[PDB]
């Protein structure tokens, strides 16, 4: 009955709020720029990067690397948050532990880039809890491996943000990503498949209710999962170019755990 | 109003049953209750464990005590989500500030676990794996220096707590009280968080008197037990970083 699926939506949207500080709704508020309750310092060249540390604090050496390093701890941080949100999906913690770990190992990137879109517009991305902004151009212009590491995310975000999803939608969508069943190494696909079937049932109703005039947003949404599986693959292989380019520069082990390609 | 308290009572009961798979009535039929319509595989020594791992379906597929500890970590993660779901049914819990909600859960979840662990225990040992198992108290004590003493003070508590002879309709209101505790560090608006508790304490108060007619002053006895929950949780939170001195994606699963 629709009555139940509305509850799973409200439930996930509540957990989504509690697991991620920077929601899409908050992100867009910062990004309009008409909302100046706090506006972001914009990094666009090396001289903004200088200032970008004067007054923006982050949790603390070529620029292109130290950017990446700070980009990397954010990744760790988002993995922590997704992990906290996953644990809230009804029945996730009831699944086999090997498969909990396997659903995370694989869904985390697809979620990371889904949510990165909330932080992006055609010109850049909010940094450091929104305190910052960093241009698509300043990113596209770092040292040669690093000068398009982050470019395709931007093209996906633009095409993905075209869906105009809000947070209540994302929360259900984020769930479906976690509970795929298509993941390699899964011990028990069918219980995963049953939760995901509920979650899709939840998504469909939500999308048709939250965006009434937007027909086949459910189908066009699900189809966006194609674009995701392809970002994830460009990323790992680009990341391997850096493990060889940068034998001196290390990689956070939690991230490493989720990269046995 | 007599009837409003009893109303919230049945609300909470109905919700606790739906949120908690293994209810105390259930647990007690299995346990010392000779309700041998089904029986749990029992773990009394090392030989029975490997037997039991092989028959029972543990959802966490490495030495003896460590494997037990992790399977314990797995159960608590599920319990948490049962507590969490249960909470959303407490009247007014959801109307709270979400930060406050997260705080009550954060600090209330251990006390609630060890409260409901009591329902799965007796002096001789404890039910495990949805009650498909029973792990004797002596086999648990018979674990390696870090691990044998982990579980003795819980068995300590359950015996005293179970002596109250509380049932699931009592534990319903009681755990609601525990959660809507307005003395948790960091809450932002303790008025509802205490307004509901004064409602909850009223309900529990009447409930105990009606279900336990001449258990004089059980309510008080049951509240002063709440000093024993805080005390254990403290000894438990302590005993979780003496083990981290011994012991990555699953580490982020179990961030305590
Ligand atoms: O830069 C990014 N993230 C961060 C990088 C550094 C950082 O700390 C920092 N900032 C500037 C310079 C050095 N370090 C914080 C973040 C963040 O997103 O939270 C980033 C975000 C999205 C995309 Cl698509 C690309 C990047 Cl390179
Ligand atoms: O056994 C307990 N928890 C579990 C530990 C392991 C486990 O899975 C398991 N069993 C045996 C060996 C290894 N792992 C399941 C449970 C459970 O409570 O459901 C337990 C329950 C109460 C108390 Cl006071 C102590 C423990 Cl150790
Ligand atoms: C940036 C640089 C390196 C990695 N990595 O090696 O995994 C990841 C990222 C990245 O995309 N970080 C991120 C995720 C989410 C939000 C902001 C930044
Ligand atoms: C067992 C081991 C570790 C923790 N911990 O990390 O805080 C907790 C527990 C525990 O008490 N598990 C449990 C809860 C509820 C029912 C059965 C078992």
Residue numbers in the entry:
A (entry chain A): 207 to 266, 275 to 475
B (entry chain B): 207 to 267, 275 to 460, 467 to 475
What do the study authors state?
Peroxisome proliferator-activated receptor γ (PPARγ) is a ligand-regulated nuclear receptor transcription factor that regulates gene expression programs controlling adipogenesis and insulin sensitization. Endogenous PPARγ ligands, which include lipids and fatty acids, bind to an orthosteric pocket within the PPARγ ligand-binding domain (LBD) and function as PPARγ agonists that activate gene programs. GW9662 and T0070907 are covalent ligands originally described as antagonists as they bind via a nucleophilic substitution mechanism to Cys285 located within the orthosteric pocket and were shown to inhibit binding of select reference PPARγ agonists. However, we previously showed GW9662 and T0070907 do not block all ligands from binding to PPARγ — and moreover, they have distinct pharmacological PPARγ functions as a transcriptionally neutral antagonist (GW9662) and repressive inverse agonist (T0070907).
To visualize the ligand cobinding poses, we first crystalized complexes of PPARγ LBD covalently bound to GW9662 or T0070907, which produced solvent exposed active (chain A) and inactive (chain B) helix 12 conformations similar to apo-PPARγ LBD, then we added synthetic ligands to the crystals using soaking methods. The BVT.13 cobinding pose is similar to its orthosteric binding pose located near the β-sheet. However, the 2,4-dichloro group clashes with the orthosteric GW9662 and T0070907 binding poses, specifically the phenyl and pyridyl groups respectively, resulting in a slight reorientation of the 2,4-dichloro group to accommodate the cobound state. For BVT.13, the covalent ligand cobinding pose is similar to the orthosteric binding pose. Each of the non-covalent synthetic ligands utilizes unique mechanisms to cobind with the covalent ligands, as inferred from our crystal structures in which pre-formed crystals of the PPARγ LBD were soaked with non-covalent synthetic ligands BVT.13 cobinds to a region of the orthosteric pocket that only slightly overlaps with the orthosteric covalent ligand binding pose, adopting a cobinding pose that is similar to when soaked into apo-PPARγ LBD crystals. MRL24 and nTZDa, which are the most potent non-covalent ligands tested, pushed the covalent ligands into different non-natural conformations, whereas BVT.13 and SR1664 do not.
